Copies of this chain bind each other. A is one copy, B any other.
Amino acid sequence: RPSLTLTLLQAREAAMSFFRPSLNQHGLTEQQWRVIRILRQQGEMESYQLANQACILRPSMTGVLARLERDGIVRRWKAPKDQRRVYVNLTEKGQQCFVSMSGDMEKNYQRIQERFGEEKLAQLLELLNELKKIKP
Q: Which residues on A are within 8 Å of B, measured CB to CB?
A: 1-17, 19, 30, 34, 37-38, 53-55, 102, 105-106, 109, 112, 115-116, 120-121, 123-125, 127-136
Contacts and interface: CB of A to CB of B under 8 A. Distances in A.
Contact of A12 (B8, B16, B53): B8
B128 A11 contact: yes
Contacts of A123: 123, 127
Contacts of A1: 102, 105-106, 109
B14 A125 contact: no
Given A127-B123, A127-B124, A12 B9 contact: yes
Given A116-B131, A124-B131, A15 B11 contact: no
Contacts of A105: 1
Contacts of A3: 34, 37
Contact of A13 (B55, B124, B133): B55
Contact of A11 (B2, B8, B109): B8
